[PDB]
Each structure stands twice: as C-alpha cells, then as structure tokens.
C-alpha cells in the first residue's frame, strides 16, 4: 500500500477542496503520484465539482467519485431530497483501498465536517478513516471560533484513534487582522500547522497555483508522506 490521507475540515466552506488541490500539487512536484477521491458530491445543480477543481488546479488525473447530488445540502439531506440513498459503506472504503498503491498519496476529501454522514447507516469520514487506516488532515479557518471547532474535531479523531496529520488554514486573509493573527498562533499550540493558503488561491491558474502550493508546504514534510 501507499499513504491514505482523509482531508476533513472543521465545517463547511473552510477550504477542503483548495487544500486537497494544494497538497496534491505540492506532492506531485516532489515526485509523488497523487490520487484524490471525493466519494459524495452535492450541489451539482449549481455546478459544484470538487474533483474537477483539483484536476484543473493541481493536474491530478486519478479522480474518483461514487455519487453526485444536485442540492447544495449535507449528503444525507441531498440524497433524501433526490429520493435516492447514499452509497454503501463498502462502496466508499473499497474505492479508497483500490485507489491506494505504493508510492502514491491518496487524498480523500469529505463533505463538510468530520462527523457528516457519507453512507448508510450513519457512516462518517471518521469511520472511513478507521477502516482504511488513514490519518486525517484537518482544514481550519482563521476566523473567530476556529479554535473551538478545531479542538472539537481533533478530539473526535482521537476518540476513534485516528491520527492527525496536522492542520491547514484554508484561507489566510490579507491583511490578516488581529483575530486571524491570534488564531494562527493559537492553532499552532493545538496541532502542527502544515500550511496557510493565501486568500483567493482557488482562483489561480494551474501555473500560479503550483508555485503557491510549492511554497505553502514544507518540502520535507510533503516528501515524507510517502
């Protein structure tokens, strides 16, 4: 096998997709083969497609998914509004395990936060992480309230013995501000801050995003992932 990392977040809209793209770009530039799995995607009616984002930003081609739901809701709510169940737990775990191979970094992007239901009955990305023996990278914001949501998420990981690979601030503001600067210092006292992506990084073209990603992550940490 290779390395499987679930990329979760403290909640919704925190930067999970752009962090997945940034780490994939950084890993590829270190020579690592990268695959990204988005088991469940919602909000397709308005055009949401996180895998296509990763492919355009980081050039990844191994992009695996199982289900797409039109409504921009939690997967279980989007599934219910469409009248079709979520995928099975076996579907998600086996897709991830089949993606995994030696020399490869396989990133699993969840929907919303860690305890969001992704499969029936009540299966979350935390359950998936246990099943595939993956560590968890936690995407956090720099905004008011992030320390509480980070601590809650890390405790939920530890409660099921899921290792934490570190934190990433999904959007670092410019200029930072008092709360943002205080939060970044405190976040590093909670867990290892692997990167802070500049605000607006999701809008970069592929070449600019690759330069940003290469500078945002520590090269020794990236190469050490596989």
Ligand X SMILES: O=C(O)C[C@@H]1CCC[C@H]1C(=O)c1ccc(-c2nnn[nH]2)cc1
In which residue are the tokens 């009616």 written?
45
Q: Which residue has the tokens 């595939």?
A: 132
Residue 153 site contact among ligand X, a second copy, none (CB < 5 to 8 Å, cut-off depends on kind) = a second copy
State the virtual CA torsion across 156, 12, 204, 188 in degrees, nearest 10: -40
- Number of residues interacting with a second copy: please give it, by CB under 8 A: 31
The response to whether 198 counts as a known ligand-binding position is yes
**Cβ of residue 101: shortest distance to ligand X, in angstroms?**
25
Measured from the CB atom, is 92 or 111 closer to a second copy? 111
Cβ-proximal residues to 194 (8 Å cutoff; 6+ apart), any chain: 137, 165, 166, 167, 168, 217, 218, 221
DSSP letters of 31-68?
Answer: T-EEEEEEEEE--GGGT--HHHHHHHHH---EEEEEEE
* Residue 153 binds to a second copy (criterion: CB under 8 A): yes
Catalytic residue selected from 29, 30, 38, 89? 38
Rounded CA gap, 136 and 129, in Å? 7
Q: How far apart are the first and last CA of the chain?
A: 10
Q: Does 6 bind ligand X (CB under 6 A)?
A: no
Check whether 222 is labelled as a binding-site residue.
Answer: no
Q: Which of 8, 16, 26, 194 binds ligand X (CB under 6 A)?
A: 16
* Contact map string, positions 13 to 52, toward a second copy, x by CB under 8 A: x---------------------------------------
Q: How far is the CB of 226 from ligand X (least distance, A)?
A: 25
CB proximity list for 152: less than 8 A, separation 6 or greater? 10
Closest CB to a second copy among residues 148, 203: 148
Q: Of the candidates 92, 116, 118, 191, which one interacts with a second copy according to CB under 8 A?
A: 116
Is 38 part of the annotated catalytic residue set?
Answer: yes
Q: Which of 150, 148, 106, 155 is nearest to 126 (CA)?
A: 155
Question: What dihedral do alpha carbons 168, 170, 172, 173 form, nearest 10°?
Answer: -160
Residue 120 DSSP code: B
The values of phi and psi at residue 138, to 5°, are: -105, 120
Binding a second copy by CB under 8 A: which of 68, 182, 199, 226? 182
- Residue 43 touches which member of ligand X, a second copy, none, C-beta under 5-8 Å by kind: ligand X
Window 48 to 107, contacts with a second copy (CB under 8 A): 71, 73-74, 76-77, 80-81
The item of ligand X, a second copy, none sharing an interface with residue 159, based on CB under 5 to 8 Å by kind, is a second copy
Residue set of the binding site:
12-18, 38-42, 50, 109, 145-148, 170, 198-202
Residue set of the binding site for ATP:
50
């Amino acid at each position: 096998g290779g390395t499987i990392l679930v990329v979760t977040g403290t909640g919704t809209g925190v930067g999970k997709t752009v962090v997945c793209a940034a780490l994939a770009s950084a890993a590829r530039q270190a020579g690592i083969d990268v695959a990204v799995c988005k088991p469940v995607q919602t909000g397709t009616a308005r055009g949401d497609d996180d895998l296509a984002e990763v492919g355009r930003l980081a050039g990844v081609t191994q992009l695996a998914g199982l289900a797409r739901y039109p409504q921009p809701m939690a997967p279980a709510a989007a599934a219910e509004h469409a009248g079709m169940a979520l995928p099975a737990r076996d579907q998600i775990v086996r897709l991830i395990a089949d993606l995994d191979r030696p020399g490869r970094l396989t990133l699993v992007e969840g929907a919303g936060g860690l305890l969001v239901e992704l499969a029936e009955p009540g299966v979350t990305l935390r359950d998936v992480a246990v099943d595939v023996a993956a560590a968890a990278l936690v995407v956090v914001t720099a905004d008011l309230g992030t320390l509480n949501h980070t601590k809650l998420t890390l405790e939920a990981l530890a409660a099921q013995q899921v290792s934490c690979a570190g934190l990433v601030i999904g959007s670092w503001p410019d200029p930072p501000g008092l709360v943002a600067a205080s939060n970044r210092s405190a976040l590093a006292r909670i867990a290892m801050v692997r990167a802070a992506l500049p605000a607006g990084a999701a809008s970069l073209d592929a070449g600019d995003f690759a330069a940003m990603s290469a500078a945002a992550f520590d090269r020794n940490w990236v190469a050490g992932l596989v």
